[PDB]
Amino acid sequence: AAVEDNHLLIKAVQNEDVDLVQQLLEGGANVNFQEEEGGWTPLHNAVQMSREDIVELLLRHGADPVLRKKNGATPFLLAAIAGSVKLLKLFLSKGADVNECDFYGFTAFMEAAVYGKVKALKFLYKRGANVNLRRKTKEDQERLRKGGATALMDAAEKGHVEVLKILLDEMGADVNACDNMGRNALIHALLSSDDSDVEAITHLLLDHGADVNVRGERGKTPLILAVEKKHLGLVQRLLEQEHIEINDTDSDGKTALLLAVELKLKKIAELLCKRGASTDCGDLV
Template sequence: MYLIAAVVVALVGVSLLVLRVLRSRGGLLGAIRQGKAARVEALLRGKPQALAAARESVRGPLQAAAATGRRDIVDLLLAHGVDPAGIDGWGQGALHVAALHGHVELVRRFLELGVDVNQRARRATSDKVPARPGATPLHFACGAGQLEVLNALLEKGAAWDSVDERALSALHEVAARSGSVEVARRLLALGCAVDAVDCLGQTPLMLALAYKRTALAALLVAHGASPHARGPMEFTPLHLAALRGLEDLVSALLAAGANPLAANDLGQKPVDVARAEGHAAVAALLEEAGARAAVTSVAPEPTTQQEGAAVVAPPLPRTSEG
C-alpha cells in the first residue's frame, strides 16, 4: 500500500513538472524564449491579452527577448508599446539583461532609445530569483566578463566607480563572478579602487582568492592590492590563499609584505588554515615564513655603541594593518 502511494505521489510530481514545462513553452514568453519571431508577431496582433499576461510574469517579455539577443523580437515588442526602460519582477531592465548576455547591439539600441546607462536594478519581487539591487548595467557586464559591452557602456558615460546596495564595485563583480582578467585590467586602468570594500569588508582580492580566480588574484596583487586587509572573521588574503592551497599566491602575498603570523578571529594563523585543509606544501612555505617573521620581531639585546656610530633601530614586526 505504501508502495502504491509512493508511485502515485511520484506520478503527480512528474505530471506537474511536465505541465510547468509545457506552460513555459506556450504563450508569448515561450515564443520569445524560443526565438519564434513569427509566432510572437501573431500573438501580439491576434491576442492583445497575451502581452498583458506576459507582463504579469516575473521575467518581463522585453527582458526575455534581450536574453536571446533577438533584435527582431525586441523591435516587435517595442512597436507594441513595451517600455524599453521597464523593470521586471527580477528587478532588472532589458539593458541589464542585454549587458549580462553580451548582446552589444541591443545594448546600443536601448541606449539610443534613452534608457539610462546607469539604470539601477531593483529588489526582485520573488525570493526564487537572484536579486541584485542597485547594480548598474556595467555591473552586469563586468560580472559576466563582457569586455565589448563594458566599452560600449563607457562610451555612453557609464559610471565605472558606482557601487550597488551591498557596496559591490565592478571589480568586486569580476572577482565574484567572471574572473575576467581583461575586464579587471580595463577597470584598473580607469582607476577602479583595487582595495574597495563591500558591506562585509571584503576586497576584490579576497573574493578572487575565495573563488580561486588565480590569474585575477595575481593581477590584483601586482596592482598593489593590500595583503593586510581584514575581511569577515578577520581573515586576511593570506588566510584565504592558504585555505585554497594557492602556493604561488601565498608566495606573492608574502613577497608583498603579508604577515604570516596574523591571526583570525578563531586564533588561526595562515599556516594553521593550510594544515587544516591538508595543503602540505603551502603549510611548509608558511611555516618557514612564520619562523623568519618571529625572529625579526624579536628586538636584539642592547650593546655598547661605539662612539660616533649610527644608531640602527631593530626591525619591527609586521602587522595586519601594514
C-alpha cells in the first residue's frame, strides 16, 4: 500500500497533478522515494519537467535537494539539462556545488553544452563553473580509455554552433584538450551524426588552432573522417594546415587518398594525390 502510493506520487508529478501531489504527501507518501530502474525521485521528475512550483512543493515537504539517482545525477544537474536558470540558482542555494558531477563525470556546465542551453551555460560560467574540466568516470570505464571529455567536445559532437562560439571566444575553452582516448574537439566534431553543422563547427575549431594530427578509435584522423563524410570544403581547409600528415593510415591500412579513390571522390582524390609523392594525379577515379 505504501509502495503503490509512492509510485502514485511519482506519476502525479509526471502528470503535473499538483492537488494529487499535495494529497499524497499530506497522506504520508515518501517524498524521497526512488523508483527501481533508474533511482529517480519525485524531485528529479519535477526538475526534468521544469516545474518550479512542484519543485518548491516537494522541497517544503522535505525532499532532499541533493539526493542522487543511480547515474549519480543530482537535481542541480537535471536543471542544467532542462536549461532552467531559476532551478540552477535554487539548488545552488540548497547545497549544490557548481562543479559537481555524476558518476560518468558530467557537470552542469557540460550538460548545458550537450543540450545547447546557452542561458544556463552563461549563468553557470558566471557562477564559477570550470570550463575545461575533463570527465572523471568509473574506474572500469577509465581502463577502457573512456572519460576525459570536455564541454567543448560535447558542443562539437552535438553540433551546437552558438555554444561552441561562446565557449571559444568568451569562456576560455581549451580547443586542444583531449579525452582519455586521445580525441579532441575536432575529432568529436567529425564523428557527429548530424550533417547539419559539421562544416561550421570544424571551421570554427580550425580558426582557434585545433590540432589536425590527432587520432580517434581505429586510427582515424580528421582528414580521413572528412574524406569519409565526402566534404570537399573540409578537406581543403584541413590541407591548408601546416603540420597535416596526409599519409597516415587508419586501422584498416587506408589513407585519406585510398579512401577518396574507393568512394570515387574525384576532386578530393586529386587534391590529396597532389599533396603526396605521386606524379600522376588526374586520372585516379
